[PDB]
Design a protein around this ligand. Structure first.
Ligand SMILES: [Mg+2]
Ligand SMILES: [Mg+2]
Ligand SMILES: [Mg+2]
Ligand SMILES: [Mg+2]
Ligand SMILES: [Mg+2]
Ligand SMILES: [Mg+2]
Ligand SMILES: [Mg+2]
Ligand SMILES: [Mg+2]
Ligand SMILES: [Mg+2]
Ligand SMILES: [Mg+2]
Ligand SMILES: [Mg+2]
Ligand SMILES: [Mg+2]
Ligand SMILES: [Mg+2]
Ligand SMILES: [Mg+2]
Ligand SMILES: [Mg+2]
Ligand SMILES: [Mg+2]
Ligand SMILES: [Mg+2]
Ligand SMILES: [Mg+2]
Ligand SMILES: [Mg+2]
Ligand SMILES: [Mg+2]
Ligand SMILES: [Mg+2]
Ligand SMILES: [Mg+2]
Ligand SMILES: [Mg+2]
Ligand SMILES: [Mg+2]
Ligand SMILES: [Mg+2]
Ligand SMILES: [Mg+2]
Ligand SMILES: [Mg+2]
Ligand SMILES: [Mg+2]
Ligand SMILES: [Mg+2]
Ligand SMILES: [Mg+2]
Ligand SMILES: [Mg+2]
Ligand SMILES: [Mg+2]
Ligand SMILES: [Mg+2]
Ligand SMILES: [Mg+2]
Ligand SMILES: [Mg+2]
Ligand SMILES: [Mg+2]
Ligand SMILES: [Mg+2]
Ligand SMILES: [Mg+2]
Ligand SMILES: [Mg+2]
Ligand SMILES: [Mg+2]
Ligand SMILES: [Mg+2]
Ligand SMILES: [Mg+2]
Ligand SMILES: [Mg+2]
Ligand SMILES: [Mg+2]
Ligand SMILES: [Mg+2]
Ligand SMILES: [Mg+2]
Ligand SMILES: [Mg+2]
Ligand SMILES: [Mg+2]
Ligand SMILES: [Mg+2]
Ligand SMILES: [Mg+2]
Ligand SMILES: [Mg+2]
Ligand SMILES: [Mg+2]
Ligand SMILES: [Mg+2]
Ligand SMILES: [Mg+2]
Ligand SMILES: [Mg+2]
Ligand SMILES: [Mg+2]
Ligand SMILES: [Mg+2]
Ligand SMILES: [Mg+2]
Ligand SMILES: [Mg+2]
Ligand SMILES: [Mg+2]
Lengths: 84, 65, 54
RNA sequence: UCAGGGAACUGAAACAUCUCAGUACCUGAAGGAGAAGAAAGAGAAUUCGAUUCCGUUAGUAGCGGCGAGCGAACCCGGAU
RNA sequence: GAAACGAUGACUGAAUCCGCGCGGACCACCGCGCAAGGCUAAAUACUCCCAGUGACCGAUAGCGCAUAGUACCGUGAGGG
RNA sequence: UGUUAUGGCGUGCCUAUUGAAGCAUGAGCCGGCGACUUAGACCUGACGUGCGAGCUUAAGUUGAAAAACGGAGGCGGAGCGAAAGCGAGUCCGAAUAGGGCGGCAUUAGUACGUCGGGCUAGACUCGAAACCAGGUGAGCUAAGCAUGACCAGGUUGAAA
RNA sequence: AACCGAACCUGGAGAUAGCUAGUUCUCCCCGAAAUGUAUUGAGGUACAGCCUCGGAUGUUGACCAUGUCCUGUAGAGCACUCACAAGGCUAAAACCUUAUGAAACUCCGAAGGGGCACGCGUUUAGUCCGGGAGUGAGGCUGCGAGAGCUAACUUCCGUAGCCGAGAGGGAAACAACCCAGACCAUCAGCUAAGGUCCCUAAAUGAUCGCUCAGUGGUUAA
RNA sequence: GUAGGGGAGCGUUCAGUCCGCGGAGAAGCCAUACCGGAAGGAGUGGUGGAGCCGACUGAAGUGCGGAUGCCGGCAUGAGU
RNA sequence: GCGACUGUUUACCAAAAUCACAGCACUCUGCCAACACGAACAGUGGACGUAUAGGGUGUGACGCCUGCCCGGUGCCGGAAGGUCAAGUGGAGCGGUGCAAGCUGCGAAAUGAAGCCCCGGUGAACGGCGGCCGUAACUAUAACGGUCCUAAGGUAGCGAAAUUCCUUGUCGGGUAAGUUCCGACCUGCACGAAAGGCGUAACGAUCUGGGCGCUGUCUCAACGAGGGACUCGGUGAAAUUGAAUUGGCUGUAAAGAUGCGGCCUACCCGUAGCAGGACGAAAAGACCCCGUGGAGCUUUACUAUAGUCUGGCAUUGGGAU
RNA sequence: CCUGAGAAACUUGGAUUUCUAACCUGAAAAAUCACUUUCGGGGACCGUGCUUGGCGGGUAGUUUGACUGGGGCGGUCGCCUCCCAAAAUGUAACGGAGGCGCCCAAAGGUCACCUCAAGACGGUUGGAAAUCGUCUGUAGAGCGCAAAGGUAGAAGGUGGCUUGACUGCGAGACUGACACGUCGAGCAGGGAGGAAACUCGGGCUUAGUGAACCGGUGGUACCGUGUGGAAGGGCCAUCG
């Protein structure tokens, strides 16, 4: 005859997107309160001027400009420095 | 005839000067022991909607009250 | 929460003050079995110490 | 016009309270009209002053699976 | 619904003046009122009918009909 | 201009669609009838107009080959809160820090009208199967009741 | 009382109808959508996204260079993770030489891609506020992948263009392909893709060759 | 250039108003090679027999090929 | 084979195996009977009948018979207790005025049937069933049989109107038999009044075989009559975008007379054929969709006629 | 005047028992009826009127989801992680694996201190692995559970004190159509650990969740209808 199957599936599961990645990049300005990076862990280390919420989010403590540094591959921070 | 005021809304939405419509924040009856603290505090309050979903409300009441 | 759950029962903390106040949290009941003594704030003054009310 | 009786489809994007609507229809009585009417009243000013009608208050006060939706009256102006 | 008041079906059926009824639970106060008896023109509603008008129709329009509830169908109600 | 021969060229129309000559829908032809409207003194806009920190009547009244009267109410005037209330302030709070608001570095309303939309009512027109009320049907058919009617001829041969 | 799972007639009544049809005068300007997110929702409604009108604003748009940070795909590699070809060697596990595969491996890692700035040099759009919408069924080739059988005029994403809403030439014929975006007129000229023996416009062209099989004019070990 | 929004207009009636025509002939109908960017609109000729064009303004039952649309007429199938 | 029989049935696609039946069986019902129509204490059927009567239900002549399970459901009965509504009773709580007081709320005990509960009941509803292992590639023609719910099939039947495997195996008939008849039993999934197994007779029933007869057939022929055809008379229909309507290959929304190419083809008609025009006919009755409908069903939800039930009114005296 | 009680009496009730003038019902010269009487019996019961609960497919109105290589069946429906996802965020599939609906009174705040998995040798029970010792030893471990990212200058392991698992807020941003959701310096009141600078309004992080509505509860004195009170309602809290 024809087909009766009968198989199902046990997967077909996923979770709605977590918008990670670096939000504010390197060489652009900032305001105070402005978030510069979202991340799962310490993908980006709190530098001089920046704070780290519970998420390990990176937020700006005062205005100015954004400074990225990777420390020769695997250790890395973002800092802030004003317009003077 | 006279367009009826939506008594559905006479305790949950607000007009203003600029014309903007306000309403409250949501989650304050069993969304409690959660908590968090800034949540429970945040939710007692009130706020202006976005836009898009504004005019509807307006049309719910003519007097604005 | 989930009704017929016996551990981590949700019970409130009533002030020794009598201000008219209460906090709300959750002890494992495989722990205290008597009550709970905590030291939280209290708007109607400043710093009470609370008994885990029924 | 008054009275005894009193639907449903519909809407609430389903339905049952609810809405349709005391509407359709049935019946009783009666007239050129009828009904209502001479305060145990509205009411909140120690004010009005039988009723019916229109304007208005007013989609306001309120009603409601507080959902759909339903919706006065006092005062104020007129008809008489 | 905090359900006042009227309203009646069944049970109960108080006071009559230093008394009775209401003021939206309920209480005092303080106000508005005279239940248990009747009639009442006027303004208002309608329009079979009569008349006057019309940025209403003129023969597929206009009522269904320039006329006819007739011809015709239907056992009938009824359609026409 | 009418007609014509020869050539090149050329997949009816509509609707429905990813895509129609479609072998997908509709329709014989021609007439004529045939569908986005009306109401409210509701809502919100655009154009316009008249008065303009002011704008306006409704019911009615009187006159009526015309219109005028009619301030009763309506819209503007100040916001803010849950509300009492406070007021260029207000609210949360014990004040701070803020949302809303006034100033703002500035600006006008209202009544009519025409129109683009909205809502409530049939809401662009046509189309159900169904649902409910009141009535009409047993001169058909299903049967009941009372009363009449009807079955050539032939075969078989029970009890007693 | 000629179609009874509930008669027929009148009526509520123009019930409702997320459904199907149909919706008429002309020219001009702009000009989409079949994506997201919810939905007793899936061929339906809300909001955005996209069109258009108009009032504000002033080059904020757009492409392109520069400068500057973010990335972990292509390739690659074996350093952990699972895999695995030979051999050593020991009591096999380890570990050495030799050796390789990977969407859920990564010592490494482009091309590109994105944010910000500049405008150093071009071009035109952008953004806000208010009116009116429609669309929310998409389709095909090319490159990326998944489910399939490295099946489909297959389906579900991504990405460019095209049709949808695109006439004109070409591909005989042929929505999608190659050229190309039709404001009218002309018995006027140059080109594109594609062509130039006749049908059928245009070299039966020129020179160096190949195949003789009608290959051309449809497949493989 | 599809759905869609915007812009300017063509024609139909009824209406206010003016220009004005008409038995030496109105509307309507019939023919045609003229005009306008288009909806459209003029010239003349034949019809007809008593009403009507034009401009401006106002109000609409205001423009049909479709709806297996409705009414009516006449075709096909067939001299079957 | 099925029914026993005569009968009945789907007006207009089904006449039978349906249905009725005589017979038997369970229950219900004592009269203003149950039961049924009913605005309803009306009146009516039941019935001017009286348990050898009347209702309801099931089986379906007759003959031998009709077993096992009362746990769930239903029904009959039982009562200790669990209980349960309004009402009876109100300790106590509070609102208020100074108050006599008015009042809002409301607990104990008591309290109806019914359900829980105990047992009985099948010609009540029903139930009378799971499984064991085989040499090989993740497998096919086959196996003999121990048996959890309350019990787990007594008689008779059984490859059947019931049989999955299936043309089961054997026998009969045939030249040859998936059909049929007998037996077989491994009954996927018979079984006792939803009757079991039989049976004379009856049957426009159903199934197989035979004898007879035959144009049913091999294989058609001749003939006849009424049409069809011709002429004079009267003259419809459904259909219909418009047609000036070929064929092959191909292309196209994938089945082309309309596009391509190539073939073929002078104009008209008449009698005939039925391949095509996805021919006409009814907007598919299958299928999906619609928060469409209606009928029917129940231990889906909600009411509710009806019906049981406590209190209240009709509603009275008394004796203990 | 009585604590307990005896006759009488008002008894107001509860039961049975009985009586009849209500009421029901039949017969007799008057059929359905109505008188009148034998009356015959029935008898405060039935029936009926209102309320009480039960039963009740006899009848009545309805509900009965969606995805879905047609529908059904089976599977799936919210949240987290990882590939797929084409080196930015994003992205489908009835594509490929797996996990959550809690847990923690210390596993949080602070303060201080400690360093891991394994292999080799050598060692009483043991002797593959237990305990101790040494040499190696940047992660080959550990983080309550899922994996990815992260981590050794600790987030890992151990103690001291502790209730920042805190009210009143919110500069500025991430994110989403909306509603949500996510991070957060800093200010106040007032604390906690450090000697301090400090750090903290929960845990390495990303799952451990449910909008309104109606109602319970603890405050609060905004509303409360002629007035002042109370019902009720609002606000903060919170529970289902
Ligand atoms: Mg209904
Ligand atoms: Mg509805
Ligand atoms: Mg009369
Ligand atoms: Mg009363
Ligand atoms: Mg005429
Ligand atoms: Mg007429
Ligand atoms: Mg059309
Ligand atoms: Mg299609
Ligand atoms: Mg055709
Ligand atoms: Mg066609
Ligand atoms: Mg169709
Ligand atoms: Mg204006
Ligand atoms: Mg206006
Ligand atoms: Mg409209
Ligand atoms: Mg019939
Ligand atoms: Mg109606
Ligand atoms: Mg209709
Ligand atoms: Mg353009
Ligand atoms: Mg879609
Ligand atoms: Mg929109
Ligand atoms: Mg620029
Ligand atoms: Mg690779
Ligand atoms: Mg190297
Ligand atoms: Mg959709
Ligand atoms: Mg797509
Ligand atoms: Mg498809
Ligand atoms: Mg389209
Ligand atoms: Mg083209
Ligand atoms: Mg082309
Ligand atoms: Mg061509
Ligand atoms: Mg193609
Ligand atoms: Mg060239
Ligand atoms: Mg040539
Ligand atoms: Mg005129
Ligand atoms: Mg005229
Ligand atoms: Mg037509
Ligand atoms: Mg047709
Ligand atoms: Mg002939
Ligand atoms: Mg013919
Ligand atoms: Mg013929
Ligand atoms: Mg028979
Ligand atoms: Mg028949
Ligand atoms: Mg027959
Ligand atoms: Mg009992
Ligand atoms: Mg044989
Ligand atoms: Mg039988
Ligand atoms: Mg017979
Ligand atoms: Mg034979
Ligand atoms: Mg003839
Ligand atoms: Mg042609
Ligand atoms: Mg051809
Ligand atoms: Mg024929
Ligand atoms: Mg159809
Ligand atoms: Mg039913
Ligand atoms: Mg479905
Ligand atoms: Mg990318
Ligand atoms: Mg997508
Ligand atoms: Mg609700
Ligand atoms: Mg409270
Ligand atoms: Mg209170």
């Amino acid at each position: 005859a024809h087909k009766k199957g009968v198989g199902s599936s046990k997967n077909g599961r996923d979770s709605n997107p977590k918008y990670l990645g670096v939000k504010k990049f390197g060489g652009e300005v900032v305001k105070a309160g402005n978030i510069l990076v979202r991340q799962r862990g310490t993908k980006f280390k709190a530098g001089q001027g920046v704070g780290m919420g519970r998420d390990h989010t990176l937020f700006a403590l005062s205005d100015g400009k954004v400074v990225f540094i990777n420390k020769g591959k695997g250790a890395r921070f973002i800092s802030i420095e004003a317009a003077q | 005839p006279k367009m009826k005021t939506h008594k559905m809304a006479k305790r949950r939405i607000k007009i203003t000067g600029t014309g903007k419509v306000m309403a409250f924040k949501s989650g304050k009856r069993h969304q409690n022991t959660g908590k968090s603290g800034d949540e429970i505090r945040g939710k007692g309050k009130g706020f202006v909607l976005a836009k898009a979903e504004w005019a509807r409300m307006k049309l719910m009441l003519p007097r604005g009250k | 929460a989930a009704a017929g759950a016996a551990p981590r029962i949700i019970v409130k903390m009533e002030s020794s003050a009598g201000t008219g106040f209460y906090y709300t949290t959750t002890k494992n009941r495989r722990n205290t079995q008597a009550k709970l003594e905590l030291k939280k704030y209290d708007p109607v003054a400043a710093h009470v110490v609370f008994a885990a009310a029924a």
